């Protein structure tokens, strides 16, 4: 209802908490996080 809803921030990591105005440092940040990730999976 009235919980602010203002000040929309860029890509904010939902694991540690970090905003990334750019669309590069964020995508790359997911690597160090995602312990497992390959072609066979996903
Ligand atoms: Zn993070």
Swiss-Prot record:
Q: Which domain of life is it from?
A: Eukaryota
Compartments in which it is found: Nucleus
ZnF (C2H2-type) intervals: 11-33
The family assignment reads: Belongs to the krueppel C2H2-type zinc-finger protein family.
Q: What does this protein do?
A: May be involved in transcriptional regulation.
Protein name, UniProt field: Zinc finger protein 484
Name the source organism. Answer: Homo sapiens
In terms of the whole protein, what range is present?
Answer: 409 to 437 of 852
């Amino acid at each position: 209802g009235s919980s602010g809803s203002s000040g929309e921030k860029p890509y904010v990591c939902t694991e540690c908490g970090k905003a990334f105005i750019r669309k590069s440092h964020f995508i790359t940040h997911e690597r160090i996080h995602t312990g497992e990730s390959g072609p066979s999976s996903g």
